[PDB]
Design a binder for these strands. Structure first.
Ligand code: MG
Ligand code: MG
Ligand code: MG
Ligand code: MG
Ligand code: MG
Ligand code: MG
Ligand code: MG
Ligand code: MG
Ligand code: MG
Ligand code: MG
Ligand code: MG
Ligand code: ZN
Lengths: 206, 165, 142, 36
RNA sequence: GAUAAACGCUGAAAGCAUCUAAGCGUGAAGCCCCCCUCAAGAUGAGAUUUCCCAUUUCUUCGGAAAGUAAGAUCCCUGAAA
RNA sequence: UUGGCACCUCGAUGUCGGCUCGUCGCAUCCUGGGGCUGUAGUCGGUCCCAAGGGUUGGGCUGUUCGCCCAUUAAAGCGGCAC
């Protein structure tokens, strides 16, 4: 069970040896460094803490500079933990290159979905519009709040609200190409996020 | 309960350990029921006389007997496979029966219990723990149990199957 | 007039360790609720908290008479529709015995702000060991 | 299995037993299997 | 993983029988895990790593006031929000 | 459900069907597990366990309902101010 952090660069497409044309997300994962190994004795669970892209000194604070020092590395923009991995693999201050993944490998991409802002129930919850004609004054509205008897609205009556910007995990994305000199993975299909989004690629739990 | 020769019994609380030539058994009994070890003879003692105890009192002599008899001479449950193409092969330790299914069904013999097949159309479960011999033979029979129309399936040795058209 | 009223901190709150091994869940609980409410002290004042701290050890060995192990159901409602979860007392004694005794005893304490303070004085342990040795707890018999 | 309030021997091979505090008749003839 | 209905094994009460009383096993789209997300206001406020340090003034001890540290903000340029 | 009663509301508890949104019960329509079968097999029937999810597009009728066309694993029955 391997893992790595990268930024979504954007999508494109590649021709397979077969000749088929597949869509791909390009994930640039330069500058992954192991920062900390968490053990059952010290923290209470096994995990490896990986720092991703280098951050200018003035953008870091002393708490940050003092935590990366232990790994003899510059401060990092993103730090995430990976559970369910072999702590024997991974040394403090080691690089984590995209070569940990091969072609045909099956991964789970985790990231935050694009922000839609305040949205209504048609876009946010896929509800039905009311009629648009035949005298209707009921188009993009959320429907009855519920029955009379409770004298209240049940929880999970779906209503308008802020829509995206949620952690999402797409499971079972095939890695298509691994390019070490450019520190790039091509994952088949799309992963959550806007371009430049942090994407967490771990070996598929399934 | 008369202990045969070579057999030994020990009592370290409310549990009894019956070790003999063929194997070695342990069984936790009800504390209330008191057991007496002599040289060659065991006697199980009932304290009161309620519907709770009278029951336990019997169960103990019988299980204790079934622990002693089981380590001395042992227990055999013999099964028959009736039907066309219904055969049993033992290819290592795993018992393997072809019994009409599109896949073969295989059984790894539990610790202490030993499957073996003289003919292809009969299986014999052997062991010391009459309980464990019982639960393997049952499970083997439960693969394809005796159907009432032709009599096809895996039955016990002297078992009466009901018949129909 | 003249009836004594305990002041906060006045009465000496002592630490007691109670072995739950083989005592009925209630029977254990009713005695402890009394010790927590401080009903065993002549200084008992209904509005104060003159009661003792209680550590229960071996709560995994608490007793359930009859079929209560399988038939006593503990219910929780999330407040979402159809959000009713249930656990059997037996399952809960095996896995979260701390929680079994806490539920049991929380029902026999007053249902007010003071009752919520009393419950903070209760320390339940599945096994035989606690980390409250520093409070020098005294063994208590039921 | 016949599940019914009134569980009675249907033939003379029928036997009335109790299991798990339910009354039942068992019989060679499987049509006679009853549980209360 | 534990169960329902169900099928059993071993087994006495009741020298037999008996799935049951003690005791084992098998067994559902269900139950609890597993999968996804939120989640320590979990006031029961949890854990790990790293940073800052023990200043000054008066004050009855209690504490109060003031400049600071690490750090954060106001303000400004913005968008992937 | 058809009713009985007249207990709340006549200084207003203001409406049948449809639409939108569901949620609950289980007396289960489908899917899962099982017993019996007039269970050879296939296709079925019936009862037990089971409420996790699922459970449709039209024509005619204001019509709930119904009838019909064509599907579907199935086109469940009820409650929530019908
Ligand atoms: Mg946006
Ligand atoms: Mg529509
Ligand atoms: Mg309009
Ligand atoms: Mg209310
Ligand atoms: Mg028997
Ligand atoms: Mg099982
Ligand atoms: Mg009148
Ligand atoms: Mg009014
Ligand atoms: Mg039912
Ligand atoms: Mg119409
Ligand atoms: Mg209405
Ligand atoms: Zn009969």
């Amino acid at each position: 069970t391997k893992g790595i952090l990268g930024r979504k660069v954007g999508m494109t497409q590649v021709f397979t040896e077969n000749g088929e044309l597949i869509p791909v997300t390009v994930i640039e994962a330069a500058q992954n460094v192991v920062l900390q190994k968490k053990t059952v004795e010290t923290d209470g669970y096994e995990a490896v803490q990986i720092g991703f892209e280098d951050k200018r000194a003035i953008l870091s604070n002393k708490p940050e500079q003092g935590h990366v020092a232990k790994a003899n590395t510059t401060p990092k923009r993103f730090i995430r933990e990976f559970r369910d991995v072999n702590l024997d693999e991974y040394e403090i201050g080691a690089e984590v290159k995209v070569d940990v993944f091969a072609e045909g490998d099956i991964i789970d991409a985790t990231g935050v979905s694009k922000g839609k802002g305040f949205q209504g129930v048609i876009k946010r919850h896929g509800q039905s519009r009311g009629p648009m004609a035949h005298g209707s004054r009921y188009h993009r509205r959320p429907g009855s709040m519920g029955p009379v008897a409770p004298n209240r609205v049940f929880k999970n009556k779906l209503l308008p609200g802020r829509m995206g910007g949620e952690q999402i995990t797409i499971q079972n994305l095939e890695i298509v190409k691994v390019d070490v000199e450019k520190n790039v993975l091509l994952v088949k299909g799309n992963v959550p996020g806007a371009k430049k989004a942090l994407v967490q690629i771990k070996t598929a739990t399934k | 309960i008369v202990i045969p020769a070579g057999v030994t019994v020990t009592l370290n609380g409310s549990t009894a350990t019956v070790k003999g030539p063929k194997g070695e058994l342990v069984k936790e009994f009800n504390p209330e029921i008191t057991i007496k070890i002599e040289g060659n003879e065991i006697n199980v003692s009932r304290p009161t006389d309620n519907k709770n105890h009278r029951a336990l009192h019997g169960t103990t002599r019988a299980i204790l007997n079934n622990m002693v008899v089981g380590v001395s001479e042992g227990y055999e449950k013999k099964l028959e496979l009736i039907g066309v193409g219904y055969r049993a092969q033992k290819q290592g330790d795993k018992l393997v029966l072809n019994v009409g299914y599109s896949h073969p069904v295989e059984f790894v013999a539990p610790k202490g219990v030993d499957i073996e097949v003289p003919a292809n159309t009969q299986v014999i479960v052997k062991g010391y723990n009459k309980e464990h011999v019982g639960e393997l033979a049952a499970n083997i029979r439960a693969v394809r149990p005796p159907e009432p129309y032709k009599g096809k399936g895996i039955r016990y040795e002297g078992e009466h199957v009901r018949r129909k058209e | 007039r003249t009836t004594y009223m305990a002041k906060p901190g006045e009465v000496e709150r002592k630490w007691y360790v109670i072995d739950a091994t083989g005592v009925s869940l209630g029977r254990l609980s009713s005695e402890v609720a009394s010790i927590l409410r401080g009903k065993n002290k002549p200084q008992f004042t209904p509005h104060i908290d003159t009661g003792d701290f209680v550590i229960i050890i071996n709560a995994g060995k608490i007793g359930l008479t009859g079929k209560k192990a399988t038939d006593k159901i503990y219910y929780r409602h999330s407040q979402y529709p159809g959000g009713l979860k249930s656990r059997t007392a037996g399952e809960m004694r095996t896995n979260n015995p701390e929680k079994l005794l806490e539920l049991s005893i929380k029902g026999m304490l007053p249902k007010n702000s003071l009752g919520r303070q009393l419950f903070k004085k209760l320390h339940v342990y599945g096994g035989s060991e606690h980390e409250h040795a520093a409070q020098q707890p005294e063994v208590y018999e039921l | 299995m016949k599940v019914r309030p009134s569980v009675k021997p249907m033939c003379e091979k029928c036997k009335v037993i109790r299991r798990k505090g339910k009354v039942m008749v068992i019989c060679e003839n499987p049509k006679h299997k009853q549980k209360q």
